[PDB]
Amino acid sequence: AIKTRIISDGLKYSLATGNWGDARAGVSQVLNRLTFASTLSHLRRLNSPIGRDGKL
Amino acid sequence: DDEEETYRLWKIRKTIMQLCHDRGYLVTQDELDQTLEEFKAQFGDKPSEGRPRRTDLTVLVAHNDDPTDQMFVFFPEEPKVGIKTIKVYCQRMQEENITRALIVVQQGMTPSAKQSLVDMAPKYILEQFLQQELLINITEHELVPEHVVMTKEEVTELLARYKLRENQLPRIQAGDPVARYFGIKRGQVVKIIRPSETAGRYITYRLVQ
C-alpha cells in the first residue's frame, strides 16, 4: 500500500532539480565551491520571490 | 455674459475673414482686420437676444478671380445642429447657383448630419467648423509653417521634374486642421515652406489622402 518512491523520489527531484513542486524554480542551487568565501556566501543567501526583469 | 459673446463672435468673424483671405477670396482690407469696437458699432453689442445675433453676419465672399463661386458662411442659432436645420441652408444655396459654404457650429454636429454633409458632396460642398477651431487662426501659430495650395499645372511640373508619382509623395490627412482650413479635397498637392536650421529654407510637398 505504501509505495516509497512517491515520498523519496519527490524529495530527490525537488532538491536535485530545484523546480519546487511536481511551481517556482531555483530553490535548490548547486553549491559554489571555487572559494571557501564563495561556499560560505552561497549558504547564507536570500532570494526575493519577486521575478526578474521588472522596471520598478 | 454678453461682452464675452460679442468678443467671441468678433474673433470668429476675424478668423473667418483671415480664412477666406488665405483661401484666396475677395476680403475687404478693413474687414480683414477690424477693431472689436468697430464690430460692436456695426452689429450692436448684445448677442444675448439682440442686434448682433446669429444669421445677421453670414459672410458672403466671392473669389479673387472667377467671381462666380462663393462660400457664403453660415452661423446657426442653435448649439447642436441637425439635418432639418441644414436643409434650410440647402434651400438658401439651391436658391442660389453656388456650391461651397461653411457653417460654424457651436456644439458638435449630430452624426446623422455629418453623414448628410457627405451625402451632397458632388452636388454642393459643405464644410463645418466648431467654435473652438475658429477662436484661433492656426496658421499664425509658430509651429505651423507656410502651407500653399498648388495648381494642377504646378503638380504636373513637380511630378515631371522629380519623375515620381502621386502615390510617392508624403501625404496629409483630409481631416487635417490646416487642410480643413484651406478646404482642400483629396488629391491636391500642398507645398509647404518652412525654415530649416541646416539649409535656410525647405519646401516639402503633401499630396492629400
Add this chain to the structure above:
Amino acid sequence: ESRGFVENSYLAGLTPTEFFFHAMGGREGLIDTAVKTAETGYIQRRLI
C-alpha cells in the same frame, strides 16, 4: 546626519550610519544601471 548627509570624506572613512546611507545611494545607482539596459536596447531595436 540622521537623514543621510555624509560629512566625512573617503580619506577619513565613513561612520557606519554614513556607510549604510552611502550604500543606499550606491544601490540606487546600480539599480539604474541594471534596469536601463533592456529598455534602451529595445528602443534601439524599434528605431532601426
Add this chain to the structure above:
DNA sequence: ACTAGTATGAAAGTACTTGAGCTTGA
C-alpha cells in the same frame, strides 16, 4: 505477485466589440 509496456503582490497599452443612450423619423 509483479513487471514492463503503455498512455497522458510588485505589465502596460492599444484596439476592437458590445451595450447603452440619444436623436430623428414615421
Add this chain to the structure above:
DNA sequence: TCAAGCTCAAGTACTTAAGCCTGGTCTATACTAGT
C-alpha cells in the same frame, strides 16, 4: 410617442518586454495486462 439607427464609452483580450558568450545538473509517473 415609439422604434430604429448611429455614436460613444467602457470593458475585455491579446502581444511584446537586450546583445553576445561560458559553465553545470537533470530529464516522468501510474497502472494494468501479462506473464
